[PDB]
Symmetry: C3
Subunit: 157 residues, 3 copies
Amino acid sequence: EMRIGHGFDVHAFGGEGPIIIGGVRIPYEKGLLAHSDGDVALHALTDALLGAAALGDIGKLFPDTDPAFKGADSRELLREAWRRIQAKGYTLGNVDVTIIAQAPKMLPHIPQMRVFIAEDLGCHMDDVNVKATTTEKLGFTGRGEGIACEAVALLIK
Amino acid sequence: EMRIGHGFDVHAFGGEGPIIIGGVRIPYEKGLLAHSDGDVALHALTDALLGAAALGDIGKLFPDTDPAFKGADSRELLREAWRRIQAKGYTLGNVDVTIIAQAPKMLPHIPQMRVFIAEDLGCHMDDVNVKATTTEKLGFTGRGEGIACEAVALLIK
Amino acid sequence: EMRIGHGFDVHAFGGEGPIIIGGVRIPYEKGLLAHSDGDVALHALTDALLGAAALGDIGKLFPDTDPAFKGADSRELLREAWRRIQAKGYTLGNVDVTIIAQAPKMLPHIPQMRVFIAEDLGCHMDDVNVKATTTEKLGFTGRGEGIACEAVALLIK
Ligand SMILES: Nc1ccn([C@@H]2O[C@H](COP(=O)(O)OP(=O)(O)O)[C@@H](O)[C@H]2O)c(=O)n1
Ligand SMILES: Nc1ccn([C@@H]2O[C@H](COP(=O)(O)OP(=O)(O)O)[C@@H](O)[C@H]2O)c(=O)n1
Ligand SMILES: Nc1ccn([C@@H]2O[C@H](COP(=O)(O)OP(=O)(O)O)[C@@H](O)[C@H]2O)c(=O)n1
Ligand SMILES: [Mn+2]
Ligand SMILES: [Mn+2]
Ligand SMILES: [Mn+2]
Ligand SMILES: [Zn+2]
Ligand SMILES: [Zn+2]
Ligand SMILES: [Zn+2]
């Protein structure tokens, strides 16, 4: 059996760079604001994975009032979600992530995100794809207020 | 054979609450403007299912020209779509919905949404996932202008 | 093996019509600005297909920088991407595209887009769905500033 999931996330710019996306530190004039590290790509991916498994979403796994994972980096959260998904009997088919950002340029950093994601999910780098697009200066991303990310995932059981 | 579909919808706030999302009435300071009940979750889901089956979109199935569904609630629209999709020989793999709203909070209402959706599609609740995310006060969702929803579905033949 | 992919694109209105969407010329008071024909639907679809095949994105394959692709139209790019994907051993499962635009009306033009996509991917028209939705005058699409498109694809290996 196969299952599909989808995730979407947005974080706002604020503070000083670098930003962290896909587990990779990217120099930039502004940072990403969040209680968390603000890794919009890993949050969206985590939600797609949890969604395919019908385990809810990242907020449901890591409640605001829960002290356990407060302070954790997003790679840690991805690995723990993944542990809980595998405990339900699933393995990974493949994942695809789309970063929506006017800047910074993501392409040079995409290879390194793929390695980190592949290590965290214990899969082949050929099962992991990441891309980026701008919105041609339109909307909150085009005005440089923040970054959004969409992801989809296919799990096998 | 398995087939994938994707849906997206947006409705604007207007008037007084409550709003209806995933078939669940939720109290709020404003209502959702729409000829229909404005249920963005169910419209996005209906489009994702129609999309997987290559049956077009909710506008093609329910034109303003057809009186049968004028004024029908969105659950009735989802069920008629599901009938057409089943007539094509499909059964449900799984669905995942992502509500994009700064407010109201969706978490406590999601259990009921899952039950209503599972009822409408004749499946187990474990084949239905619903999550939500804010856009951190950015964009028309972040400013509280309206609500958006994305959905993916996997059908089996 | 089955594999999923997702794509998203945006282009801004500017210049004279028509606009070109899914390979179809649609009359409109403005065109879509781009170094290209600005076909958001085909770009998003090309990205979903490349994504499923873990080949990156249209910008990795066809950099706006490289003269080899100067003046290529979006169908030529979709076909070349498809050529590369098939060379990797994949065949088409199905694709679903969602155009997000306040105007012009897409519905009358969608059947032709389906034909063109099916021709370019060498598949049956029934493996290709295209839909449209407005955002109810909200956001950059609602204000008539640009058009967005999301797509998903399922490939078989
Ligand atoms: N309208 C909404 C928005 C999000 N939420 C929940 O609140 C959690 C956090 O939302 P957020 O948009 O602040 O997420 P982050 O990437 O900051 O963790 C989500 O993961 C959902 O559990 C909700 O229930 N209702
Ligand atoms: N640019 C557009 C937008 C929507 N549509 C069609 O119009 C219908 C209604 O779009 P809408 O955004 O008003 O949809 P609702 O969720 O209000 O029903 C869609 O289902 C499509 O069939 C279109 O043909 N062209
Ligand atoms: N923040 C971003 C956005 C896009 N890109 C890359 O830049 C290319 C072109 O982006 P774009 O938004 O102008 O795309 P199109 O005009 O080609 O549809 C993308 O296809 C990615 O390869 C990036 O690396 N960093
Ligand atoms: Mn409408
Ligand atoms: Mn947050
Ligand atoms: Mn561009
Ligand atoms: Zn986040
Ligand atoms: Zn709607
Ligand atoms: Zn484009």
